Amino acid sequence: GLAEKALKALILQCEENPSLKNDKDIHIIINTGKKMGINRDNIPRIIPLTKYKLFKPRDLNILLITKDPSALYRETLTKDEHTSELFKEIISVKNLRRRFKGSKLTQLYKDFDLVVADYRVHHLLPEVLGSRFYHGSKKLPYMIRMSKEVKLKRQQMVEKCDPIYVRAQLRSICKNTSYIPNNDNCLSVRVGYIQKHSIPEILQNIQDTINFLTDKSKRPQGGVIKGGIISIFVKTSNSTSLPIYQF
Amino acid sequence: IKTKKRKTLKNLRKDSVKRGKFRVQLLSTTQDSKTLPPKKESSIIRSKDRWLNRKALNKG
Amino acid sequence: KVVIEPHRHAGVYIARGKEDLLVTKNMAPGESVYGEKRISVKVEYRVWNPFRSKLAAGIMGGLDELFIAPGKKVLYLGAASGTSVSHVSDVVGPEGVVYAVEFSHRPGRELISMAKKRPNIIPIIEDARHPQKYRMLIGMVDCVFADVAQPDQARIIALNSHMFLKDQGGVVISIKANCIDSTVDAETVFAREVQKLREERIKPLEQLTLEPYERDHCIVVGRYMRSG
Amino acid sequence: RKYLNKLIKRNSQNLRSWDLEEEVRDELEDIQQSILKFVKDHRYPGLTPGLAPVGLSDEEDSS
Amino acid sequence: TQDSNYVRTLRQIELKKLEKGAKQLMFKSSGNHTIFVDSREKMNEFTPEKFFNTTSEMVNRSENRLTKDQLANASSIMPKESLDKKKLKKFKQVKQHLQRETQLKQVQQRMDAQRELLKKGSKKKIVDSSGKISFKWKKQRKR
RNA sequence: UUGAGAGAUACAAUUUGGGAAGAAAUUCCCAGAGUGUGUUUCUUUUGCGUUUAACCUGAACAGUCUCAUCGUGGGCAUCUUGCGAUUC
Known part of the structure; x- marks a missing residue:
């Protein structure tokens, strides 16, 4: 009671x-x-x-941060009609550092509500994003698998992307x-x-x-x-x- | 029906049952063993006779 | 510290210490014939290697009527290199006797040394299939073992058992399927050799597949009734 | 009679204890056979916490 | 050449020390046991317990089968927890012998391949289909 | 998606025996066995279309000279981070 x-x-x-x-x-x-x-x-x-x-992702705007090249990532994600309406913005880390600093950075902070990036870039993320994001847990950058594929020692990895898997990640996250x-x-x-x-x-x-x-x-x-x-x-x-x- | 009757017939003819890790089978009858050389090998008869019934000669 | 325990058959013992092992009681102690290890507890002992002696694998495989007894006379076809024959000598003890047979040479000399160390041994250095050159020296064996790769296992047993095995005698043979057939399944070969002996007056009581120790061998044990 | 049976049970328990094992049985079975014969990256441990709970309905539904 | 000598000496060490460890170690017999019966009624009425004059677990256990009359372990120090673990310990210990043994065998084999690569002749390097290098020598009798 | 076989099972029910408890009824323990159902294993058959098919070899890697092996110098940590291995 x-x-x-x-x-x-x-x-x-x-x-x-x-x-x-x-x-x-x-x-x-x-x-x-x-x-x-x-x-x-x-x-x-x-x-x-x-x-x-x-x-719900339908209710929330969202940012995705890829690896560097990001060409196929972004075009595939925007094309497969399962995320084109889903991810509000997609940006690579280098382009992000080229585009935003300081004022525009906190402008982003105000704009977006939930962000995520590749799990091979998450650890690098802080310094390009700023302590200003790094407070509390409201706009704390998330971490999503992007390939559903793994790496082996002394074996080159191959990079892919699948909207079913990534959309599952996002929906799971906003659900819980x-x-x-x-x-x-x-x-x-x-x-x-x-x-x-x-x-x-x-x-x-x-x-x-x-x-x-x-x-x-x-x-x-x-x-x-x-x-x-x-x-x-x-x-x-x-x-x-x-x-x-x-x- | 006739199927299960055939099955239980084969059971009442079989001389080998499994008892856990142990396996049980008979010793055959001396009368048969003396009056009859053992039966032949279906694998080998099928081999040779199929060979005569090869499909390269138009045996059909 | 070490624990001795007896087996279903006389003379066979298992040591439960830091380990568990198969062992017999040396009449001749402290003289390891083929570099096998040993143990004392006081009295002496001598271990078996199943991987080297077929009969040992049978002992671990479990056999009820293995007719080789301490107070007994046992014939041993395929006695080579003296190992397993030394073991059976040691298990029959002073009162038991082991009539070993060989026909190669080099194991013959090794067995000669083994006889030179043990009295219960009696070596015969003759033809496997020509049992006369030892009919005139062997008398009334009660139990026969044979490990021979001459595919006339059934013959050689039949002959020497008619000449030597007293009635209701005990017979035990090792069979190498890869030696006699090497094309058809070892189960088939085992059964076939079974009715072979069956005709050759062995009542076949049991057989052990020597599965987890050696490849494709069966030990067959039977008795010998109203025969001669 | 019954006393003999009880002695049998006692000594049988003794031998069973001498040779006892419950799951070491299967373990040593695997080991003896061998002798006689999920996701994880190697370079980011942070991934095992970072991952999300894949959920079948969560892919299937077109909400 | 000296590296090959070193490795092969270690490999021999591990190999025969394995064989000793095994020869003192013991396995469990898993072999088939088919019994002979001269009558189908005796087949049906068969029970290993009565054929052996033993008990249940005595029948099921293989390498030691003592009859009831033959019958007619606290001295073991905490056997429920101790001796079993040490037995598994020995089994493991043998296991890493053998696996280290195979690993050293591979190392020695590849390293002798390299030596041969060095020695002499008219070599040829081919990339075999799964993507693995190999060397073939032109047909040539060395004088 | 021809039959038939063998086998592995899993599930369900049915029961074989030894011990124990029980006055007994019953219960316990232990090794079981078969029935059916589901699963798969493997064999042969049956019928059908179909003459090749794989590997080996002979003077067969090498003028954008190939190959081996020690060393030096740089790329990829947003990771092929490199094994007495062959990262580039």
Whole structure:
């Protein structure tokens, strides 16, 4: 009962307070009994939802960053009529560094809502994009496989692209949500939008997320919490902590 | 029907059953063994007679 | 530290120590005839290598009526290089006797040395198929083993068993399918040789495929009744 | 009679313990046979976390 | 030439030390066992338990089959966890012998191919269909 | 998508026996076996169209001189990052 009661309270406080109206996302912060031994990189680690979808590519604009050549990538993606309406913009890293700096960079930051790049370029990405993107997890660059094909030692790779696979990645991503490991007990994840869905959906999402995080299976991805979990607080971008599952 | 009757006929004729890792089979009858040289080899008879019934000679 | 344990047949022992192994009790101790290892516990012992002695593979393969006994007289066709015949001498012990036969030479001299070390051995250095040159020296074997690649296994057994194997005697033969046929399946060859012996007055009691140790061999064991 | 059966059971348990194994059985089977005879890149470990959950309905639907 | 000598000496080491390890190690017999019966009724009524005068697991286990009358391990130190693991340990240990052995065999073979490449003659380099190099010498009797 | 065979199974039900518990009814343990269904293995057959087919070789890599092997210098980390191997 505490959960949805606090949810109603935080909602009404949002619609009353000016700025609390202006910030628009629900965030939940889990404090764990033990710290995490996983040092913070910026690899966007995502968590699955079993019940309810959240965002749709049809609803969101999107940016893709390729490898350097990008000719066949872009033309194929724009041609195969499964992504031509889907990816708002496509750019190579070198062209990006040639085109945007400073002011225009933060202009991008304001414009786009979700970006992704090839997993062979993600680690290079930060310096061309900027600490300005690299805050929080709202416009944290994602990482999608692009070929559905692998590399072997001493074997040249061959590069391809398939809209079915890539569109599957995007739809999966916007269906579910993500997180980033830390080295202390405090980890934060955005959970749901303030009007796209309802309190029962919120609670279902929360329960599925906590079950995934506590699940013994999928240790490389889901079994990451160490020790008995302490509690879960809820907030928006500027609100105060609200307690759930105190013990 | 007639099929299963034929099957159980073959069962009541077979002299070899499997008992786990062990395998069981008879010792044949001395009377037959003396009065009859063993039967022939279907593989080899089919070989040679098919060879005479080769399709290069227009045996048809 | 090392544990000894007896087998279904007399004289065969398994050592459970850091390892588990097949072993016999040396009358002549501390003299490893072909570089085989050994163990003591006190008393002495001597190991078998199944990969080198066909009969050993049979022992591990499991055989009920393997008629070779301690207090027994056993004939040994195909005794070459002295290894397995030394082992059977050691398992029959002082009261048992092993009538070994060879017809090559070099293993003959090796067997000569082996006899020079053991009394239960008695070597015969003669034709496999001409059993007279030893009829006049061999008498009333009770159990016969043969590992020979002369495809007249059935003959040689029939002859020397009529001349030597006392009634209701025990007979055991090793068969190399790749030696006798090498074209038709070893199962077929085994069965065929079975009715061969069947006609040749062996009651065939059992056979072991020597599968995980040697390629394409069968050990056949039978008895010998109302025969001669 | 029954005492003899009980002694049989006890010594049988002894021998079984001497020769016992449960799954080391199959393990040593594979090893003895050998003796007698997903995605991962090598250069970016960050990929195993980075990947997404391929989902059959998520490809199939034309939403 | 000296590299070849070194490698081949190591290969001989591993090879025969393997053969020793095996000769002290033991395998399990998996061979077929077909029993002879002189009557179909005895066939049907057959039971290995009664034919052996033993028990269930005694029948199923192969290399040691002791009868009930023949019957008529805490001294083993924690056998449920210890001796089994050491047996698997020995089996493994043999395994890496043999695999290291084959690896060194390959190394020595390729390196002697290189030596031959060096020695003398009228060589020819062909790229065989799967994409693998090889060398063929013109028909020529070296004097 | 001719028959037939052999075999592997998997599933389901059916039962063979030894031990134990049980007054017994029953239960347990253990090795089983067959039936059917699903799966696949493999063989031969049956009929059909069809005379070649693969490998080897003889004076057969080398004027845009090929090939080998030590060394030097540079490219590809947005990765063929290079094994007593042959990255270019």
